[PDB]
């Protein structure tokens, strides 16, 4: 387990605006099979190495890949406040998981 992940940290954002979620896995040459993006316990999106990006039907109208190797979550609501996760699925290293916290203001 030589790798680590740098995230967007802890960010605040205004209600009704956009936000960018980003993670970077450094310190390993491992295969990255798939990244799962979660809002708390709910699946937001997956980026699969072979088959690309797929957006959950619960977020298609406001979640878009990019910029970079992350997501843009639009039309923010106060209930979007909370934890966010970027779960890296790797070979042979295993499963690294990064955390972001987002607070939606007013």
């Amino acid at each position, epitope marked *: 387990m030589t790798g680590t992940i740098e995230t967007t940290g802890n960010i605040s954002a205004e209600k009704g605006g956009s936000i960018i979620l980003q993670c970077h896995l450094s310190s390993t040459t491992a295969q990255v099979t798939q990244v799962n993006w979660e809002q708390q316990d*709910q*699946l937001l*999106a997956i980026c699969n190495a072979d*088959l690309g*990006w797929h957006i*959950s*039907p*619960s977020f298609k109208d406001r979640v878009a890949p990019g910029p970079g190797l992350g997501l843009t979550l639009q039309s923010l609501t106060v209930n979007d406040t909370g934890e966010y996760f970027c*779960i890296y699925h790797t070979y042979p290293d295993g499963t690294y998981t990064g955390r972001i916290f987002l607070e939606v203001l007013e």
Partner: antibody
Amino acid sequence: EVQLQQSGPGLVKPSQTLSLTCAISGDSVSSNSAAWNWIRQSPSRGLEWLGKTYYRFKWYSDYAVSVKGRITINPDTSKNQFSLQLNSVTPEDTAVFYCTRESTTYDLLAGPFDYWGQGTLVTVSS
Amino acid sequence: DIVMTQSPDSLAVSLGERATINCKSSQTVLYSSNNKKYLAWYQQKPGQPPNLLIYWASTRESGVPDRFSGSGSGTDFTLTISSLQAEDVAVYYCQQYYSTPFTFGPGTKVEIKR
């Protein structure tokens, strides 16, 4: 084709729990390219989606707001099935309940319902 | 939620004639990235579950006779039966699988005029 075989009692007393199982043949409940759904149909409300469970390196679920708090859909990997539990039923829950496979082969998180169970008529009555 | 409507509520067509039915979604279900329309059509006969006929708005499911076809824009859809057969009497539903919760139209009943 996939076969979906439903079982479970149809008659449920008001305020008690409905429990149905869908046994899968010809696919795996953990398949990366499917999601396992429950639908209900009644003369009053037509066809309505209730919930789904699916595995994308990890088990996920989604439930309709009209049953949130009362509904659980759990996979059983050893028996290759998935179940429905609906708590605190009222006569509004009387309907035909269907399990179905959602085929998510091109969009990994969305697709049509390509195979269906035979349906279980559920009657909420004392 | 997305609301699906259908028209007409019922139709009666002579044996061998063309039957067409309409569906509308209250928002677009065309996803620009893959250019797919997230729309399905089902057939349901009495006592049976719905049976998938068309998905991606215009792709016919395998085993479905080729007299069944679909087309549409991002919001308005049509299911056409080119030559109505006696065994085609049933209720036909459309359904979006674009956003949660997935939702169904109210159904159009298709009958034979004789």
